[PDB]
Symmetry: D3
Subunit: 308 residues, 6 copies
């Protein structure tokens, strides 16, 4: 009844998830046309199946989004019983508000486009804003890296019982507090004004920078400098989504981090060759379990504060 | 061509809004049946009209929301050209995420109901979350108390050029940092562990607690003590939405608040009498302007 | 697969229905906030379940309606397979038309709000207007008290073979005729102009007043007076929905009824202490069977003219 | 800015409506293909126009409904600003409840089709059920023959101040009681057990059978006998919708009807010739007024 | 779980399909009212069933379409689990475009009306335009006569290895080429300007006229004349839909065809008495299998190029 | 009251369109973030305005489509009165049928996205399929290059009164027969078996290959050889949409094409330099006229 498909050829995560469910990845014939439009062909009857499409890590976001939609489309008109998208890193998630400007809420637009395409259910990890669930009318299971993050912290940072959980921006207040309270440790908060301000004691402690995503890495670098200027022993940075476009690898390789930790919601294998500070958590068991629970009607909640 | 309608009782804000525009509020027959139902009769023809309903303050949010939806409805089936709802304080607005629970996103449910009721356009002020603008597919105009708050602060706090703007929770980091940045002064945050924790420098300076809304004031009155214990010279509390239910009023007088400032997005005339330090910024002109500018095709965002 | 929930704390009817299906009521954490908004929390995974929400008898209709919706909402985004509302007494049902006025069709509005909230199916009893089914696009099973009413009449009114079934208003013509024809007895019809007019013979017979709902009871009282003025032996009044707000208890206790019969679509236990003329039919087996049939795909029709 | 279009053939009512407004009916090319399909060509540009389609009377309701939907459609995709449908007699209108059967609610299906066809606004007369206004989410304006019926009665029944208004079924209680109340006279109801039963006092007075529509007239012609047997001085039958199919016409002449009054919501010019006593109230001015007032933003409800 | 119903009394095809699935046709009470509106009553609980409505061959298209819709409606509000319409010949299918005119896309309108009525899935055969699938948002299985056509051609035309597959119009280019290529034979193309032009060699070969539908038969007749004027041995005409309104029977009986082949997507029994050139392919096994596959989640594709 | 906005870069067509109407293109801030996202800022107030977005030509169709949807969106939530999208060349337009595969109908998916994005009205040119007008429920106006193609042919092919209009596929029968009929000349079709097959008389006459679009030009360059081998005097190729990706440009110069004519529905200024024989019909006036006539309520279809 359950059928999984991948997007494009960045199929590592999808095949990882497949393996763990004891399934092969469903057959697809997906190619860009000479004019840059995307062809998609579903190479096996999905008629009355519980279909799952895992979003690609290609990098190119619009080519990835049209492909994801077109697949959703193909699968619905082919009489799939239900189409879930496993979208580890939700596109345009940083565009969730107008910000006093005459701007689009592209997070919502995308939310609509997934919905018209024929999506029935959404599985994602760590939405940039919690409220992005509210841009949909269908159900959304937003999973957390937070328990595996806690796992990583405890098994890898000797001084985790005496660290500080810092936010690189004001927006990520709740996220860093929540982790600190569970770890029973202090928290601190960097805000940018062309200068950063730090509130909270970090002196003679290990500072851990927690964010949901890092893109160009300009911020976290400037934030690790600040933390080492205010007397932190050493600095870690943990991001659930490792986007790392442009000068990120350069900014990191130079930057005064001990380690940079990301999940494989985005492909890292290529970035890891050129950057020796990047460690990768595998989140495929979390995504696999989510699908598995979903298909059975078992509680996907048990993953919000437990590592399968 | 324009018509302005009010809510249950709570006419003051509306009456004010209709004044600044030089109109009289529209004829309506709102009442409650003996069995808790909400009864509505539109006392004039709204056919082909640009209508504006201003949300009431009966201090009963389900009754008020229902009356609001029943109005939009009567208007939409009486061939009104358009129905904007002026809801300065958006109902169920803190219920905008599951938060790891199996809980409703009620502000989405509410957005969806206003939508299906026939509301074409929304006007509100300081939405608890900015994202509860993406709950709608109809356009929303969200006004800010931010400029009126600033003006007041400068014109009312002698030491402001050395004051600290303080968030009562962690979830209020962005709102305060903004206010602190415009004023070019320090910011500080408080978090409930319970035991309260304060990050930021508040020693020997005027503290200004800033929240979008206070309900019980429990959190903000604690926030005040913690701030005194921290050695704040004088603590102030600014709130855009003053809900003040339960123990709220008494809790304030029992606190050290030099003053408490709110905008009349909710009727305070009752609670003012029971509280001396309360002070109100009048936001009607801002709502009236946004009504005219919407109607005229004039730039609303300027008021931001 | 089947899960039942109640609304608010008026849980008598809901637990009655639960008992009869051999189920416990699903766990909910429901409280009004200090500002009068309603919190709701579903205290157990409903993921892929056939959920049923039975509408509360609290009395306060708007607080009851938001709560019902919010629950519907919580349950849908929590991936319930299907959400049915068992709404014994449909709110705003008397507002089903404009009545030559510039008024809302609040019955339809409510019908829409249930529908956007995420309702998939509706189970109700004795809609004020049959056409209220037409305010929905989803399926609606409108059940009747009429067979149990007939049961009550036959077992409780000795002279039922020689009674008259009277309508308190013109609107309820079809309802009273239908009962009379099945009982093979006469019918009569009261209309209000500030005076009532009666058409149909009632002289030296037992008059039974049949309505779907009574609220303040002003009408039926004035209608029992009329009936006793036109020579009816004694007067009964049977209403499916016992609303009884305001002076109803006072109007009844004084009023010249032999008995007032209501179903427990609305709580009566409190009203029954202060009013000794109120008898209560239990309709929980009818509602239980309806749910039971629904969940199985058995014919809910068999209840329209049979008492389970 | 306004454009009025007609139906299949059945132009009379439309032509009349367009006259009272001083316009010419719009150019169209409505026909039937040899294989029962309905063909439509809008013979002019309706781009940006407030359009009005007046429902035909080919005495084929499925054909007519389809032609109506195909018109609304062609109009909506040819960029017409708005499409009101003038359907004096709403199709499938008695199919507004299951009635304990597993039957369709077809008037809801029909409402839904007009809706999805692109109709923005409805204008109809004496809806069989008032509730079939809540079938739509677009606004509906329902006109009443009630005032034209009354006027006629007073001006045509000598004894009216002592007459009885009689419902042919139980389901017609509300409509007659209303008419009886305005006239301040007696009301009486009939119910088919079959054997007919009469409740109300009709002895030695003029009886007036009032229904919204008659189809076979079977029920109403019986109703007439029962009323004579009851000792009615003279029986009359008023109907807002005169459908008169099957045996209807002959059944009337075979009855004792002093006269039978209908409104030209349906073409009667054919059936009149075969029936002497039939008399028509002309409701075009009422439809024309409601068209102008809708267009102008003028108060339509006054016509109620 | 599976329930089939017919439309009107033209029940031959529906009962043929029923027989083959080993089912009786579901009970319906369907009659036109005196005013020409259609009554429909579903004479047995379809609650939670997989319902199938096969479209009538009455001839009268609007009376057939309202009836089909009303049935769809009745079935949805009666809580059918899913409503499929088996619409062998899709109504208004020739009205799929504006054609440089201020005209309706009545194919789309119909597509919408089926969709609002409550249709969940569509099963049809040989849409006039492939793109008619795109007028729906629900799934559509468009089946082909083409494999059975190929079957008929091979078993009935001795010279099929040396024939020409001709199009009566320009629109039907792709259709005729595809058949010719599979049969490895030549193709030709008639276009109308008040004169027809033929492109492609037909000389001393058997010409087969292939169209999807023939209505009045004016075209194909004038096209068989042309083909015999350009030296074709004998002419066949194969149409999937035999509409044959008006002078068709007369035009055919006179016309120089060897044979006229139609499927029973439309009733033929009556036309066959008066016209001896009409042969009928039975397509009920193709439709039966389609339903059968649909209900099971088996691949309906296997019928696109195979004859069950 | 009108406002015209452009796409990514590809301003030429827009700039031209805004010229012929006497307006300046609207202020926007379109860019790409370093991580492939599309960023948009509407540089002015579109509140209550009839807006027109003209689709870009960055030669990246997913990027371009997304930027287009993000624009429509920003416009719709900034209270613009209406949003027409001028998409001369409709994206994913050949993906309008499954074609016996389990493939997407992407042009329906695309129609659905433009729709849900908030687009109220579409203007396009020579849709690959006429039916991809029924993909929308909002009205579409489809312009034809047909008259500009004809005019050019007559005014550029000396022998045209004895020429043959040739389809490169079987699926192009209707489009060519039409063109051949207006010109009152012969038509001929080609089909790929592969081996190419030609039906129609092209011997000793000028051949004109006519397609709606060419992408690789592979098919059309073969089509050209087959036509020479058939004894065509001079072959021409007219295309309404010149996509010319991959080997296209080189394939043309390597072919015998006397000339290749395209409309600037796509920027050709780059590919022209690399190809001498390419010639462009300027369709801006036709798009500008259709923009004004839409706005004014003026007859657009005349331009057909």
């Amino acid at each position: 009844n359950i059928k999984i498909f991948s997007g494009s050829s960045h199929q590592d995560l999808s095949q990882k998830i497949a393996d763990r469910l004891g399934l092969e990845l469903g057959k697809v014939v997906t190619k860009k046309f000479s004019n840059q439009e995307t062809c998609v062909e579903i190479g096996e009857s999905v008629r009355g199946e519980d279909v799952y499409i895992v979003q690609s890590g290609c990098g190119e976001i619009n080519d990835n989004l049209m492909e994801l939609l077109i697949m959703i489309n193909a699968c619905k008109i082919a009489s799939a019983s239900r189409v879930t998208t496993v979208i580890p890193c939700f596109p345009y998630a940083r565009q969730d508000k107008k910000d006093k400007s005459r701007a689009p809420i592209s997070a919502k637009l995308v939310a609509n486009m997934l919905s018209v395409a024929g999506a029935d259910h959404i599985i994602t990890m760590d939405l940039h804003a919690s409220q992005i669930q509210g841009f949909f009318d269908i159900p959304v299971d937003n999973l957390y890296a937070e328990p595996a993050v806690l796992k990583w912290i405890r098994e890898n940072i000797s001084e985790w019982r005496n660290c500080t959980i810092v936010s690189p921006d004001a927006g990520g207040a709740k996220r860093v507090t929540s982790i600190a309270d569970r770890l029973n440790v202090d928290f601190a908060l960097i805000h940018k004004e062309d200068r950063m301000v730090l509130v909270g004691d970090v002196k003679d402690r290990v500072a851990i920078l927690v964010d949901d995503m890092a893109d160009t890495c300009g911020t976290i670098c400037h934030a690790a400098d600040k933390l080492l200027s205010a007397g932190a022993t050493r600095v870690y940075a943990i991001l659930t989504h490792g986007i790392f476009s442009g000068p990120a690898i350069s900014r990191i390789n130079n930057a005064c981090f001990e380690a940079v930790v990301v999940t494989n919601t985005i492909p890292q294998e290529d970035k890891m060759k050129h950057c020796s500070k990047i460690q990768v958590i595998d989140i495929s068991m979390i995504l696999a379990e989510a699908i598995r629970r979903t298909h059975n009607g078992e509680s996907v909640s048990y993953l919000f504060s437990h590592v399968p």
